[PDB]
Structure formats: C-alpha cells, structure tokens
Design a protein around this ligand. Structure first.
Ligand SMILES: Cc1cc2nc3c(=O)[nH]c(=O)nc-3n(C[C@H](O)[C@H](O)[C@H](O)COP(=O)(O)O)c2cc1C
Ligand SMILES: Nc1ncnc2c1ncn2[C@@H]1O[C@H](COP(=O)(O)OP(=O)(O)O)[C@@H](O)[C@H]1O
Length: 154
C-alpha cells in the first residue's frame, strides 16, 4: 500500500460536496473499537454516490462548527437486495461529544482504495489506521488543504 494517493492537485469528479444528518449506525459500536464512525443519513447519498466507486475516500468534513480531515467508507446496505448506498465518516484527530442528529457537511477530495473483504476486527483496525495516515499525507498538499476553508464550510 502507498502512503499517498491521487494527483498533486484536486481533479474531477472531486471536489464532491454534500451534507447529511448523522444517524445511528447498525449496532456495531466503533467508538469503543477506537475508531468511531459517523453513519450518514441514507436519504442524502443514494443518488449522489449511486454511480461512484465503493471504497474509502478522503477529504474534509464539518459538524458542530468544526472542520477536520476525514476518511469515508462508501458501501451498500446489507439488509436489502436492491442497491442501497451507505456512507460512514470518521473525523480525523477530533476531540468532543457525539453529534447524532447533527448536520454534517462533506467535501470528498479523493479515493484511496476499494472495500477489502472483511477479514477480522484487528485487520480492519489496521486498514483504517493506514487510511487515516494516507488521508493526512494526501491533504498535506496545498491544492487539497485549501479546501479546509471552502465556502461550503462557511
Ligand atoms: C474509513 C473506513 C474504511 C473501512 N474499510 C473497510 C474495508 O475495506 N472492508 C470492510 O469490510 N469494512 C471496512 N470498514 C468497516 C465497515 O464500515 C464496518 O463493517 C462498519 O461496522 C459498518 O457499519 P456499522 O458499524 O454502523 O454496522 C471501514 C470503515 C471505515 C470508517
Ligand atoms: N472523531 C469521530 N469521528 C466519527 N464519529 C465520531 C467521532 N467522535 C465521536 N463520534 C461519534 O461516534 C458515533 C459512532 O459511534 P458508534 O459507537 O459506532 O455508534 P453507531 O454504531 O451508531 O454508529 C458517531 O455517530 C458520532 O456521533
């Protein structure tokens, strides 16, 4: 795995902007697993990411008036056959209370990798830490980091 992904400058189809209410996940408490994930409201990503690649992306997200670099996992809902999009966001390097029912605004700046077949909790923790390390290295570049002051976050 590479320690950095994407071009030096943001390229189409990024940036991709949207917002959604943070709702409860599916029971799996990631907060204790050291990797809390914010399940975005399904009614805001269905069409927008319907034809986007499943996988982990990166960029910036805002909630409770604060912007943080982030990693987003985009997959499908398992409870149904018909393709139902799902998205979960992990705000990187944040300290605070939970923000359920709060509107989160997201700016996707790039793709990291496709969804790896689930292979246990430990491996998944390892994969996500690398993801976080990659997102930071990727957004340390001017073209990407300036999006932290994007009008959408104003
Ligand atoms: C940034 C990130 C990347 C992830 N990558 C993978 C992956 O490659 N493969 C996988 O099976 N699960 C991956 N996961 C875990 C799933 O999202 C996990 O099953 C999650 O528990 C599902 O949502 P729930 O906790 O609300 O049930 C990832 C999670 C995040 C936040
Ligand atoms: N840095 C963070 N990134 C993402 N979510 C966070 C973060 N800090 C706190 N949270 C909270 O953690 C919650 C997810 O924790 P979790 O135990 O997995 O509950 P759920 O299984 O319903 O998603 C989010 O809904 C959010 O309110």
């Amino acid at each position: 795995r590479p320690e950095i992904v994407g071009p030096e400058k943001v390229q189409s189809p990024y940036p991709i902007r949207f917002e959604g209410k943070v709702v409860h996940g599916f029971g799996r408490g990631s907060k204790e697993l050291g990797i809390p994930t914010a399940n975005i409201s399904e009614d805001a990503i269905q069409e927008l990411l319907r034809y986007r690649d499943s996988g982990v992306y990166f960029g910036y997200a805002m909630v409770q008036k604060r912007v943080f670099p982030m990693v987003m996992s985009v997959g499908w809902n398992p409870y149904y056959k018909n393709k139902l999009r799902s998205a979960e966001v992990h705000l990187i390097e944040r300290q605070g209370e939970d923000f359920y029912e709060e509107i989160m605004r997201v700016i996707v700046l790039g793709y990291i990798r496709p969804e790896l077949n689930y292979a246990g909790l430990d491996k998944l923790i390892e994969d996500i830490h690398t993801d976080i390390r990659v997102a930071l290295n990727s957004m340390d570049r001017p073209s990407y980091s300036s999006y932290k002051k994007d009008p959408f976050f104003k």
